[PDB]
Design an enzyme around this catalytic site. Structure first.
Site, PDB file in Angstrom:
ATOM      1  N   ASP A 356      -4.108   5.434  -1.099  1.00 51.47           N
ATOM      2  CA  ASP A 356      -2.660   5.279  -1.104  1.00 51.47           C
ATOM      3  C   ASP A 356      -2.087   5.437   0.307  1.00 51.47           C
ATOM      4  OD1 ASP A 356       0.047   7.274  -1.460  1.00 51.47           O
ATOM      5  OD2 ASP A 356       0.058   5.376  -2.575  1.00 51.47           O
ATOM      6  N   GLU A 396      -4.932   0.664   0.440  1.00 52.17           N
ATOM      7  CA  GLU A 396      -3.700  -0.003   0.041  1.00 52.17           C
ATOM      8  C   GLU A 396      -3.048  -0.560   1.295  1.00 52.17           C
ATOM      9  OE1 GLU A 396      -0.136   2.337  -0.633  1.00 52.17           O
ATOM     10  OE2 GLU A 396       0.462   1.000  -2.271  1.00 52.17           O
TER      11      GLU A 396
END
Ligand SMILES: [Ca+2]
Ligand SMILES: [Ca+2]
Ligand SMILES: [Ca+2]
EC number: 3.2.1.135
Length: 637
Positions: A356, A396
């Site tokens: 993330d 990501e």
């Protein structure tokens, strides 16, 4: 077709599929033998031109005729690049008398390219199960309530002055007055996922699960981590996780599975004990005291209220990675008991991490996308692969993730927003993944895909996370205006393209949903049966992909880009199978003459459209098939 001072681009082709590259992921001691296709007797000479990073200079390798293809329509030339541990990039110069053409990742060109060369990265390897699998993404609280006891009731606890609210399954996700959308809990847990493994691995056929954050945190999404070492109570305990993992890996309930977890390492929640903004622990967090044993884990501009965070959210304090060997790098990945190694080692042995906000990880509050950020992900790879060489690392990133992949020292792949999600959305729905007006034609769609694939080494390409929708964008079903056929078309492309097909829970049956949090609705289990149109199709497509390796690791060649009729055709092929995919993006049916001769499908041979089950015969190097509007055909042999 002849030595006529003319190189015919249409007969040229190369990529790193098995028919053209014998060593796609070589080690320091393996040489790479490349083959270039051209029309039969079309050229006089060809050369491989590669830049060697060890040398910082170009090197020349003349090619030689090697063979013809089964149909006797093309020639194959070959040349070999020497083995070494250095990274290299190559392109081809193609000559027919006074005519010269060049060719690389971006295809043919009359002038010599300066970008988009093919990649050779010695010793760089991405897990093959990732390349060959189908992923299913699950947002824990919305998939299935397996245990209603660990449920969070409407008032169970409070966060930053707000009570949590429990919603009845199927209810709207938006919070009721006096509550917050980040604290709405429908009830889904790990137990449920475990019980629905049959639906996942059999009904659909997916063999890889990717879960949104599952560790202790007060919100719905749980990206505001409070304790990385404990499964959040609402989802179960660490023993539950171990049972889930064992069942995922088991082959008694379907295919061997793989589990990928979401690692939020750029920041923690403001309620984590290292920070402890609300004083939920007796210990003293960074926000509480400049003498805190974890004070240096964060960056304060003005202690204690102004500090570095994720996109300005005060609830997400940004971790300070410092220099190599720092305590932070230790608890995140270097230590045996770090977050990354803990779950990768038994008794958990998970299979990978989704990173993330990967681009922002840095030291001293800086925003990443710099030397330090890349050094950190480099150390991260060594720590991970050191424990499990087959553990996947997916970062990501919404744009070109080349900086974290092309060196083969950081991530294995990335969330493919730029090379899959966006282009697909705009071509089929006329909207971007945000649901804003944005449309492209078939020729632009094909150009978009080719350009984005060229940003990455081939093994990275085959490992990209290709999803139609996810937890941070609007549902494909909504962007399509509720037209199921658009979903049909999308699934078919998804299951036949380059990269790991990733199904955002619910998408397989057409679930709708707008911008967050409306994109996180609970899963309607009465729709999760083959009795549903999209589901039945998804199951069929997954079966088709698992049947043909050419769909997963084969070559990719554009066959048709018709803007008037909106017809897109491309082929996937290796040494065993040849598959021509025909997609109809129009609102009316079209009869298309597929040029399967480009894939070397022999005349008089037959192909089966795996979508309709109908069979055809190759006539004059063509296949004539009527394709319904917003639908497709998968012609294979
Ligand atoms: Ca020629
Ligand atoms: Ca529950
Ligand atoms: Ca405290």
């Amino acid at each position: 077709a002849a030595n006529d001072n003319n190189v015919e681009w249409n007969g040229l082709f190369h990529d790193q599929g098995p028919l053209f590259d014998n060593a796609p992921e070589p080690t320091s001691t393996q040489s790479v033998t490349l083959k270039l296709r051209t029309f039969k007797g079309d050229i006089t000479s060809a050369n491989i031109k590669y830049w060697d990073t060890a040398d910082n200079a170009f090197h020349w390798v003349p090619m030689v005729w090697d063979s013809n293809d089964p149909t006797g329509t093309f020639d194959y030339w070959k040349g070999t690049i020497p083995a070494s541990p250095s990274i290299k990039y190559y392109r081809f110069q193609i000559n027919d008398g006074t005519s010269t053409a060049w060719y690389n990742g971006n295809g043919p060109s009359s002038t010599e390219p300066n970008a988009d060369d093919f990649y050779i990265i010695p010793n760089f390897k991405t897990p093959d199960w990732l390349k060959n699998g189908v992923m299913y993404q699950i947002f824990p609280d919305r998939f299935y309530n397996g245990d209603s006891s660990n449920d969070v009731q409407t008032g169970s606890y409070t966060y930053n002055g707000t009570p949590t609210e429990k919603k009845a399954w199927g209810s709207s996700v938006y919070a009721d007055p006096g509550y917050d959308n980040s604290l709405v809990f429908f009830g889904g847990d790990l137990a449920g996922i475990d019980q629905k493994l049959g639906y996942i691995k059999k009904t659909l056929g997916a063999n890889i699960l990717y879960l949104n954050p599952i560790f202790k945190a007060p919100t719905n999404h749980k990206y505001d981590t409070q304790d990385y070492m404990a499964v959040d109570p609402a989802f179960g305990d660490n023993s539950t996780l171990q049972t889930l993992i064992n069942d995922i890996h088991s082959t008694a309930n379907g295919p061997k599975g793989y589990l990928i977890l979401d690692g939020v390492f750029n920041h923690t929640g403001d309620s984590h004990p290292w920070f402890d903004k609300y004083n939920n622990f007796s210990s003293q967090g960074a926000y509480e005291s400049q003498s805190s044993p974890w004070y240096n884990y964060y960056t304060f501009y003005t202690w204690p209220d102004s500090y570095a965070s994720f996109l300005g959210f005060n609830s997400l304090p940004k971790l300070n990675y410092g220099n190599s060997g720092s305590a932070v790098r230790g608890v995140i990945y270097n230590n045996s008991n770090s977050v990354a190694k803990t779950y990768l080692n038994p008794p958990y042995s998970v299979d990978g991490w989704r990173l993330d906000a990967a681009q922002y990880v840095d030291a001293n509050g800086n925003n990443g996308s710099d030397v330090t950020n890349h050094q950190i992900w480099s150390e991260f790879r060594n720590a991970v692969k050191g424990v499990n060489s087959n553990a996947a690392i997916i970062g990501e990133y919404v744009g070109n993730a080349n900086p974290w992949t092309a060196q083969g020292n950081q991530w294995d792949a990335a969330t493919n927003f730029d090379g899959f999600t966006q282009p697909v959305s705009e071509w089929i729905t006329g909207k971007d993944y945000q649901n804003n007006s944005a449309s492209i034609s078939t020729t632009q769609f094909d150009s978009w895909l080719r350009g984005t694939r060229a940003n990455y080494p081939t093994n990275v390409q085959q490992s990209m996370m290709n999803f139609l929708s996810n937890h941070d964008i609007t549902r494909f079903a909504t962007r399509s205006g509720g037209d199921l056929w658009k979903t049909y078309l999308a699934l078919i492309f998804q299951m036949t393209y380059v990269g790991t097909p990733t199904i955002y829970y619910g998408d397989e049956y057409g679930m709708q949903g707008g911008a967050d949090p409306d994109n996180r609705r609970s899963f309607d289990w009465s729709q999760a049966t083959p009795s549903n149109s999209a589901v039945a199709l998804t199951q069929k497509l997954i079966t088709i992909r698992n049947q043909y390796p050419a769909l997963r690791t084969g070559s990719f060649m554009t066959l048709i880009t018709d803007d008037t009729n909106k017809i897109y055709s491309y082929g996937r092929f290796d040494n065993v199978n040849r598959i021509a995919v025909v997609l109809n993006n129009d609102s009316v049916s079209h009869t298309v003459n597929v040029p399967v001769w480009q894939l070397s499908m022999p005349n008089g041979s037959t192909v089966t459209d795996k979508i309709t089950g109908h069979s055809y015969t190759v006539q004059n190097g063509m296949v004539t098939v009527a394709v319904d509007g917003h639908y497709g055909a998968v012609l294979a042999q």
